[PDB]
């Protein structure tokens, strides 16, 4: 090992422990955070071979196997549900089909699950920011039946309710309504799982989506009529869930009907100087993606990974640039972040990928911040890591905790801590991530940045 590397490793251990100190000291200063819009229920089933075989043969093995090779768009029958699961098994392929039959949804609910946890980017971040970081959190919950409300952890997590004409803020367990259970059913299977002659080449999972409301970005009445009163109780906002929007809907409505309401919400946030952070998850519809980019000028900040930034470069950059960004090639990423900032004028862009983060911020001049991350080799959990990274950096920077680079360092600590432990309960547990070595390949990659930019 070179002396310059050994010196850099020691420098980063220092910056990492200092950035953790700054984050613990500033997070208590955040008056409140608003999380919207997507909250649902995630039901996880660890598939059982004998159970699956018995259900396939119950419904007719022949037609179910026909469906494996002729897969439909949506689940319209129990046979299509089982055929889709076996297809995911045969291919070792992550798949998600929408359940458009109420009868299939009764079958799914009856079949059950092994564990139940909150889903949706606003839902899981309410448990992190409210439950773990102890930040007062207002979360949008489109439908809040008992099964949905109990998935929130204890802490300063709140939903708005109307006591006549006045808006109150209560824990979700105290605001249960006669509303729909929005369940995404997740069927996991290991490598080598076998059913009949079908054998998985990889571990993966098949998702049956039985959630009509988050698919339309449904906004509950408290958020459509009391948004201004809600805004007065928060300092920051994180917006997510718009990636599902379709160009057209069977009732004659379009994505514009939803984005118009989002735009009104942003206007209210900006009138109160609330800092907003948009999670720009992969948006399949290219027109909707273009409109989301046209909405970014009203956001304070936006976060994305290599796949999400490449997807955006497909509509405002060039094709070859997108491919380089997809592979995480750091100079093409930097160009892409400037292409995005030129197009929108947004104040802050946070890029995150395996090994390093980048933050491009605009002030009197554009500043670029770089951080090598802490990689857990065999993580106990990978769900919600990307949202954890993007939300943690935004909240600690705009909470005042040490600056931009330090906010990136805290997010890297939170990501590793979550990966090591599966699920966090208290923010002090993130100190354990200081034990994870910093990525040395990214540490030496910063040498290329200094030669090209100085």
UniProtKB/Swiss-Prot annotation:
EC number(s) on file: 2.7.1.-, 2.7.1.147
GO MF term set: ADP-specific glucokinase activity; glucokinase activity; magnesium ion binding
CDD domains per record: ADPGK_ADPPFK
Binding-site positions, D-glucose: 42, 96, 120-121, 184, 211, 387
GO terms classed as biological process: glucose metabolic process; glycolytic process
Temperature-related properties: Optimum temperature may be above 100 degrees Celsius. Activity observed at 100 degrees Celsius is about 8 times that at 37 degrees Celsius. Thermostable up to 95 degrees Celsius. Retains full activity after heating at 90 degrees Celsius for 10 minutes and more than 95% of the full activity at 100 degrees Celsius for 10 min.
Outcome reported for the amino acid change (mutating residue 387 to A/N/S): Complete loss of activity
Compartments where located: Cytoplasm
One protein family per Pfam: ADP_PFK_GK
SUPFAM superfamilies for this protein: Ribokinase-like
An example Gene Ontology CC term for this record: cytoplasm
Cofactor: Mg(2+)
Major location (coarse): cytoplasm
Positions of Mg(2+) binding: 279, 308, 387
Assembly behavior: Monomer.
Family: Belongs to the ADP-dependent glucokinase family.
HAMAP family associated with the record: ADP_glucokinase (MF_00809)
Described purpose of this protein according to its UniProt entry: Catalyzes the ADP-dependent phosphorylation of D-glucose to D-glucose 6-phosphate and glucosamine to glucosamine 6-phosphate.
Protein name: ADP-dependent glucose/glucosamine kinase
Taxonomic source organism: Thermococcus litoralis (strain ATCC 51850 / DSM 5473 / JCM 8560 / NS-C)
């Amino acid at each position: 090992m070179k002396e310059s590397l050994k010196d850099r490793i020691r420098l980063w251990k220092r910056l990492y422990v200092n950035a953790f100190e700054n984050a613990l000291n500033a997070i208590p200063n955040v008056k409140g955070v608003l999380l919207a819009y997507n909250t649902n229920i995630d039901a996880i089933k660890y598939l059982d071979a004998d159970d699956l075989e018995k259900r396939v043969t119950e419904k007719g093995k022949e037609k179910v196997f026909e469906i494996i090779e002729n897969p439909p768009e949506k689940i319209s029958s129990i046979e299509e549900l089982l055929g889709g699961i076996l297809r995911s098994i045969k291919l070792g392929k992550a798949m998600e089909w929408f359940v458009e039959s109420e009868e299939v949804r009764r079958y799914l609910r009856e079949w059950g699950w092994d564990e139940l946890r909150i889903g949706g980017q606003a839902g899981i971040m309410a448990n992190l920011l409210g439950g773990v970081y102890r930040i007062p959190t207002i979360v949008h919950v489109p439908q809040n039946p008992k099964l949905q409300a109990e998935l929130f952890v204890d802490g300063p997590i709140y939903v708005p309710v109307f006591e006549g004409n006045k808006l109150k803020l209560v824990h979700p367990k105290d605001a249960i309504a006669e509303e729909e259970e929005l369940i995404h059913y997740i069927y996991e299977f290991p490598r080598g799982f076998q059913v009949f002659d079908v054998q998985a080449p990889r571990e993966n999972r098949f998702i049956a989506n039985a959630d009509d409301y988050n698919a339309r970005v449904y906004m509950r009445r408290e958020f459509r009529e009391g948004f201004e009163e809600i805004t007065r109780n928060v300092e920051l906002a994180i917006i997510s869930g718009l990636q599902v929007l379709k160009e057209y809907y069977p009732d004659g409505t379009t994505y514009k009907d939803v984005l118009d309401r989002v735009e009104s919400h942003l206007n209210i946030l900006n009138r109160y100087n609330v800092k907003s952070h948009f999670e720009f998850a992969y948006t399949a519809n290219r027109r909707v993606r273009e409109a989301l980019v046209e909405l970014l000028p009203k956001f304070t900040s936006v976060g994305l990974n290599e796949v999400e930034l490449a997807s955006i470069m497909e509509i405002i950059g060039d094709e070859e640039l997108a491919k380089e960004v997809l592979e995480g090639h750091i100079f093409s990423v930097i160009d892409a972040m400037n292409v995005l900032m030129d197009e929108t004028g947004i104040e802050r862009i946070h890029f995150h990928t395996y090994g390093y983060y980048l933050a491009l911020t605009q002030g009197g001049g554009r500043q670029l911040a770089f951080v090598p991350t802490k990689i857990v080799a065999s993580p106990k959990s990978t769900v919600g890591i990307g949202d954890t990274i993007s939300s943690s950096a935004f909240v600690s920077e705009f909470g005042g905790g040490g600056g931009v680079r330090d906010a990136l360092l805290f997010a890297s600590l939170a990501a590793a801590a979550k990966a090591m432990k599966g699920n966090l309960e208290r923010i002090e547990q993130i100190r354990d991530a200081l034990s994870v070595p910093t990525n040395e390949r990214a540490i030496v990659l910063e040498e290329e940045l200094e030669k090209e930019f100085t």
